[PDB]
Amino acid sequence: SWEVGCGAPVPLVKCDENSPYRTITGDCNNRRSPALGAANRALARWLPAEYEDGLALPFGWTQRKTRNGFRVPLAREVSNKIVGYLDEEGVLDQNRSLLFMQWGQIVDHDLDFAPETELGSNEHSKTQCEEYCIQGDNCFPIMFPKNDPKLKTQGKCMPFFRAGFVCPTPPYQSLAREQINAVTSFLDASLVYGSEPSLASRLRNLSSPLGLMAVNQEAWDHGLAYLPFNNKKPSPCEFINTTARVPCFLAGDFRASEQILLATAHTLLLREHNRLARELKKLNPHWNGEKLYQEARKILGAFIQIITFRDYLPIVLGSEMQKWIPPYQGYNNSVDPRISNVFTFAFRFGHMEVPSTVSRLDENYQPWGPEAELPLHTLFFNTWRIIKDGGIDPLVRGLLAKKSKLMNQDKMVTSELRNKLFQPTHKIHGFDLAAINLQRCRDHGMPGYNSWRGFCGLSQPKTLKGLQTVLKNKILAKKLMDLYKTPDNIDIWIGGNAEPMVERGRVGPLLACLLGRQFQQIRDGDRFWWENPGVFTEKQRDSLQKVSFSRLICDNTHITKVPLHAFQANNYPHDFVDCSTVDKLDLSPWASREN
Numbered sequence: 001s002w003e004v005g006c007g008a009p010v011p012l013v014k015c016d017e018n019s020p021y022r023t024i025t026g027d028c029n030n031r032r033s034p035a036l037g038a039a040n041r042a043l044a045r046w047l048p049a050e051y052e053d054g055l056a057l058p059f060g061w062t063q064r065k066t067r068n069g070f071r072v073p074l075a076r077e078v079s080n081k082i083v084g085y086l087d088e089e090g091v092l093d094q095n096r097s098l099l100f101m102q103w104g105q106i107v108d109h110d111l112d113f114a115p116e117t118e119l120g121s122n123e124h125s126k127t128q129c130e131e132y133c134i135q136g137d138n139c140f141p142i143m144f145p146k147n148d149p150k151l152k153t154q155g156k157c158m159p160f161f162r163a164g165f166v167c168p169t170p171p172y173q174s175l176a177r178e179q180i181n182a183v184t185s186f187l188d189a190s191l192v193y194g195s196e197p198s199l200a201s202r203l204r205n206l207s208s209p210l211g212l213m214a215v216n217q218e219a220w221d222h223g224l225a226y227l228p229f230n231n232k233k234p235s236p237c238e239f240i241n242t243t244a245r246v247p248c249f250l251a252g253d254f255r256a257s258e259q260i261l262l263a264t265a266h267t268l269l270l271r272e273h274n275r276l277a278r279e280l281k282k283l284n285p286h287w288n289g290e291k292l293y294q295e296a297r298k299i300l301g302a303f304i305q306i307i308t309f310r311d312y313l314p315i316v317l318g319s320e321m322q323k324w325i326p327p328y329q330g331y332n333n334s335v336d337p338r339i340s341n342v343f344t345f346a347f348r349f350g351h352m353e354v355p356s357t358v359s360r361l362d363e364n365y366q367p368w369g370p371e372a373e374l375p376l377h378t379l380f381f382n383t384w385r386i387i388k389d390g391g392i393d394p395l396v397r398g399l400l401a402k403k404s405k406l407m408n409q410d411k412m413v414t415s416e417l418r419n420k421l422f423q424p425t426h427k428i429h430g431f432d433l434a435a436i437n438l439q440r441c442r443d444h445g446m447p448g449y450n451s452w453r454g455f456c457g458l459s460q461p462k463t464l465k466g467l468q469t470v471l472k473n474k475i476l477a478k479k480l481m482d483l484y485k486t487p488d489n490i491d492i493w494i495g496g497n498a499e500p501m502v503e504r505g506r507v508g509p510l511l512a513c514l515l516g517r518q519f520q521q522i523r524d525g526d527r528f529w530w531e532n533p534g535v536f537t538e539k540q541r542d543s544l545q546k547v548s549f550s551r552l553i554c555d556n557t558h559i560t561k562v563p564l565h566a567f568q569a570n571n572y573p574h575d576f577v578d579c580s581t582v583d584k585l586d587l588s589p590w591a592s593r594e595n
């Protein structure tokens with residue numbers, strides 16, 4: 001008999017019995033509970049939060065407060081001892097293209113964003129944390145251990161600001177702190193169109209009644225569109241080359257410029273909307289602007305959903321795919337479609353799949369120019385390498401011909417991310433995404449590794465010998481026991497990712513359960529799922545059946561040689577075919593021949 005959810009932010013709640021189109025915010029998707037899966041609401045709690053104080057303080061905040069009678073190891077020490085490796089040789093995935101890593105980050109970006117609290121935008125609050133490393137309020141610095149090389153070149157800490165939470169921005173009464181999902185839980189292309197009405201209108205071309213998305217006016221890719229620039233400072237994309245002065249891009253999601261291949265993928269998606277808008281005009285010259293936007297938006301939403309669930313999830317989950325995601329049996333309005341706090345950590349498995357280098361290939365799939373291959377760390381917030389060095393085609397070839405990094409228990413996160421991560425505001429290519437992932441776990445009050453094994457109906461090792469058996473690795477198990485003293489204390493991010501990969505998949509059994517459940521819930525609980533009776537026509541649905549990533553590239557770049565199966569390892573010229581031969585999306589069924 002406890003009171004039900006403080007939602008003082010987001011009072012707006014007006015819904016519509018007609019609507020054949022998703023809202024931008026994802027409101028009104030669920031008729032009975034219409035805020036479920038909407039942006040700027042709490043992440044769902046599959047299990048109760050676990051803070052040191054039971055409310056808000058993360059484990060590792062107070063020196064003398066143990067977790068189950070043991071101090072928690074520093075994020076950065078766990079990073080250094082477990083996550084790091086030197087040798088990039090033999091680390092590549094012989095059966096996953098780099099497009100595999102890249103699609104993951106896109107889907108993640110559609111589903112969840114828990115952005116850091118905004119009580120320090122052009123304030124001397126950010127600097128307190130950076131310079132002086134002093135813990136307090138929303139500053140929760142990543143302190144270096146004794147023998148850390150970063151001590152010698154970077155100071156005592158790496159800065160870290162706690163994530164936004166609902167009813168902000170000082171804590172409340174006697175409910176655990178709940179972090180905001182700032183995008184739509186629905187796989188709805190929010191990353192392209194935005195999750196706020198504000199950003200959604202900005203991105204749109206409201207000059208012509210063609211329902212087009214705004215494209216770059218300052219620069220073109222052999223006639224093909226770039227995303228608009230984000231004319232705001234400080235721009236991190238300007239910071240990394242003040243001679244190029246190429247701003248970050250403006251997309252439906254904030255993080256589109258974080259690295260050059262995400263920006264690339266955002267560019268294909270935008271172009272595809274525009275191509276769809278133009279072809280719907282041809283076939284329906286009567287349709288006004290809004291109609292064209294919405295009818296293109298909804299097709300691209302289907303596209304993202306089909307590629308994710310037909311092509312991507314099966315080669316993530318492998319043998320566990322059908323245990324968790326059986327054939328669609330239609331909309332179930334009883335399902336919770338909200339993204340869970342734990343999913344936003346479970347989906348970070350993607351971090352082990354990022355390789356140390358990126359390549360540009362010519363029309364013969366050969367090194368484009370003399371610096372064709374670049375270290376990943378020089379491509380954080382790097383847009384000028386696209387604008388002033390060959391557009392997205394050389395990079396979209398590298399996404400086809402190059403391989404993802406394979407998860408390895410001995411080689412977890414490349415030093416490009418683990419030591420050389422660039423963050424906006426901060427000046428240096430010197431951060432640790434592994435350490436960030438671990439502090440964030442604690443920041444979100446995540447239950448430990450065994451709570452989540454429990455949740456998924458899996459054994460809970462309590463001994464070294466127990467952990468060895470589960471991880472199938474005596475040395476990794478040893479290092480974790482030395483750090484965490486009990487498997488109960490292991491942060492789910494590292495515990496989940498340390499498990500050996502399921503047959504035909506790229507995650508362990510724990511992550512397969514957590515990912516599997518979340519993707520089942522976003523499908524079965526989405527009123528606007530593409531294959532859900534009444535959303536498309538029977539004829540339209542047969543047209544959608546035919547989409548491929550290959551087609552997406554043929555239609556939206558100057559590439560003519562692609563593989564049939566974009567996510568497998570594919571070598572040129574053998575596994576490559578003429579676009580001429582690749583199933584089109586026939587849009588005839590969108591023609592409103594009748595009235």
Ligand code: HEM
Nearest residue numbers: 101104105108112113114259344347348350351354436440
């Ligand atoms: C070069 C590639 C990538 C970079 C530079 C990158 C960087 C980042 C950064 C900086 C964060 C925020 C960390 C924090 O404040 O807690 C993050 C979060 C995340 N990343 Fe990545 N990432 C990359 C690739 C991927 C991939 C391939 C996936 C999945 C397949 C992925 C999934 C996630 C998820 C799920 C989150 C949490 C998002 C949220 O709800 O806030 N990332 N990434």
Ligand SMILES: *[C@@H]1O[C@H](CO)[C@@H](O[C@@H]2O[C@H](CO)[C@@H](O)[C@H](O)[C@H]2NC(C)=O)[C@H](O)[C@H]1NC(C)=O
Nearest residue numbers: 240241242243244245246378384385387388389
């Ligand atoms: C900043 O960007 C500029 C280009 O905008 C880079 O310089 C092209 O770079 C190389 C020379 O190193 C040549 O291929 C071109 O002739 C350059 N053009 C110009 C106008 O310089 C420069 O290297 C970048 N700097 C960094 C630190 O990345």
Ligand SMILES: *[C@@H]1O[C@H](CO)[C@@H](O)[C@H](O)[C@H]1NC(C)=O
Nearest residue numbers: 094095096315565567568569
């Ligand atoms: C590669 O993965 C595919 C699924 O993408 C699978 O059907 C096949 O067994 C694998 N091929 C090789 C060469 O191992």
Ligand SMILES: *[C@@H]1O[C@H](CO)[C@@H](O)[C@H](O)[C@H]1NC(C)=O
Nearest residue numbers: 205207208212213214215216
């Ligand atoms: C809007 O569309 C018109 C017609 O295609 C075009 O001329 C104009 O540049 C577009 N504006 C933007 C900002 O994309």
Ligand SMILES: *[C@@H]1O[C@H](CO)[C@@H](O)[C@H](O)[C@H]1NC(C)=O
Nearest residue numbers: 329331332333334335336524
């Ligand atoms: C709908 O969802 C609930 C809870 O997930 C489940 O118990 C119920 O049986 C479902 N019904 C169908 C037809 O899937």
Ligand SMILES: [Ca+2]
Nearest residue numbers: 110184186190
């Ligand atoms: Ca979404």
Ligand SMILES: [Cl-]
Nearest residue numbers: 357373374375
């Ligand atoms: Cl290189």
